[PDB]
UniProtKB/Swiss-Prot annotation:
GO terms of molecular function: ATP binding; Hsp90 protein binding; identical protein binding; kinase activity; protein serine kinase activity; protein serine/threonine kinase activity
UniProt miscellaneous comment: Can use both ATP and GTP as phosphoryl donors. Phosphorylation by casein kinase 2 has been estimated to represent up to one quarter of the eukaryotic phosphoproteome. Casein kinase 2 has been found to be increased at protein level and up-regulated at the level of enzyme activity in the majority of cancers. However, elevated levels of casein kinase 2 are present in certain normal organs such as brain and testes.
Pathology linked to this chain's protein: Okur-Chung neurodevelopmental syndrome: An autosomal dominant neurodevelopmental disorder characterized by developmental delay, intellectual disability, behavioral problems, hypotonia, speech problems, microcephaly, pachygyria and variable dysmorphic features.
The protein's Enzyme Commission number: 2.7.11.1
Main location: nucleus
Tissue expression per record: Expressed in gastric carcinoma tissue and the expression gradually increases with the progression of the carcinoma (at protein level).
PTM description: Phosphorylation does not directly affect casein kinase 2 activity, but may contribute to its regulation by forming binding sites for interacting proteins and/or targeting it to different compartments.
Region ranges (Interaction with beta subunit): 35-40
Organism (species): Homo sapiens (Human)
UniProt name for this protein: Casein kinase II subunit alpha
Reactions catalysed, as given in the entry: L-seryl-[protein] + ATP = O-phospho-L-seryl-[protein] + ADP + H(+); L-threonyl-[protein] + ATP = O-phospho-L-threonyl-[protein] + ADP + H(+)
């Protein structure tokens, strides 16, 4: 028989209660700005789906970020656009400022608010215990918001988190992989970066939900408090699950497989083996102990569960003791 169905335990029917237009991005008509309002200054980066530049809007002299898209299905551009427009003004969500097209090449480009970011491979090593709790709380505000709005980010990782440390400003960016949550929908499991893929993606369980972002957030938190990047360092997608199983144990993995009646890929049978669930203490040492506390460990444990239904929601995560001093300081 097939796999047992699953539903998000929070914000389950939020898109159903909305007009069709809210989530039916295939019928979205794109509103285009003037390409001549922007002059590219320099290249900032790239990805599999785009080339990123810094630009100046010459009508108001403001610095912006321009994401020039490589060839991609128009419905995927409509999806990114619709999600960015729906989430606009939301806490710590990047602002989509404009959408332009080159009149000759017909290449579309998305224009974003600029964040004066410090590269994580330089910033993270300077973060104190308080900074990690502070920035994790800022990411949770963005996740609880997009989840409440019926959207899963599906690509939560350090590279998609822009931090202006001087101004303690955080933005969750690159909504190119984000989707609308619909109960009963089967999603593509070939999403997210290897090191941040949830167990549901690695076992090919397609009926996933917002809880996928919570696994990714747990991977991020583990790399920051343990100063071990990446935390789960797989050689490929199969070995990625082996790396998780060597920490969380194989018993809870097979209990998860059995609960949802998942047909496990035969490749896994000879590589998963048998592993006990490890204690978080084995990753604690003299160079990271200042970042690790019993409440950081309790919080991390509640994020990194094989069973997606048993992970903390973003709202539950915000109520965790790990954030008591951040919450107090914000009041
Ligand atoms: C623009 C986007 O979605 N992706 C993206 C963004 C960047 N870089 C930056 C850099 C900065 N600020 C730094 C001081 C220069 N900002 N400020 C806001 C935004 C946004 N949005 C942004 N994006 C690099 C690569 C990618 N992609 C293709 C691969 C990773 N997913």
């Amino acid at each position: 028989s097939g796999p047992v169905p699953s539903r998000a335990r929070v914000y389950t029917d939020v898109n159903t209660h909305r007009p069709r237009e809210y989530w039916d991005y295939e019928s979205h008509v794109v509103e285009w700005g003037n390409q001549d309002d922007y002059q590219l200054v320099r290249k900032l980066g790239r990805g599999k789906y785009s080339e990123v530049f810094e630009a100046i809007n010459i009508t108001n002299n403001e610095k912006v970020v321009v994401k020039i898209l490589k060839p991609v299905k128009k419905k995927k551009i409509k999806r990114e656009i619709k999600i960015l427009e729906n989430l606009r003004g939301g806490p710590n969500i990047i602002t989509l400022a404009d959408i332009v097209k080159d009149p000759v090449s017909r290449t579309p480009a998305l224009v974003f608010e600029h964040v004066n970011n410090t590269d994580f491979k330089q910033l993270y090593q300077t973060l104190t215990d308080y900074d990690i709790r502070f920035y994790m709380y800022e990411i949770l505000k963005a996740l609880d918001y997009c989840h409440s709005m019926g959207i899963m980010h599906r690509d939560v990782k350090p590279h998609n988190v822009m931090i202006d440390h001087e101004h303690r400003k955080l933005r969750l960016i690159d909504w190119g992989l984000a989707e609308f949550y619909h109960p009963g929908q089967e999603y593509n499991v070939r999403v997210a970066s290897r090191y941040f893929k949830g167990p549901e993606l690695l076992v090919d369980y397609q009926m996933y939900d917002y809880s996928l972002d919570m696994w990714s957030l747990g991977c991020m938190l583990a790399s920051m408090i343990f100063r071990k990047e990446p935390f789960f360092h797989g050689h490929d997608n199969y070995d990625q699950l082996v790396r998780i199983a060597k920490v969380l144990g194989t018993e809870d993995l097979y209990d998860y497989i059995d609960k949802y009646n998942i047909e496990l890929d035969p490749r896994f049978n000879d590589i998963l083996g048998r592993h006990s669930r490890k204690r978080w203490e084995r990753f604690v040492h003299s160079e990271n102990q200042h970042l690790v506390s019993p409440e950081a460990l309790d919080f991390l444990d509640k994020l990194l569960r094989y069973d997606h239904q048993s992970r903390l929601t973003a709202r539950e995560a915000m109520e965790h003791p790990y954030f008591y001093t951040v919450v107090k300081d914000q009041a």
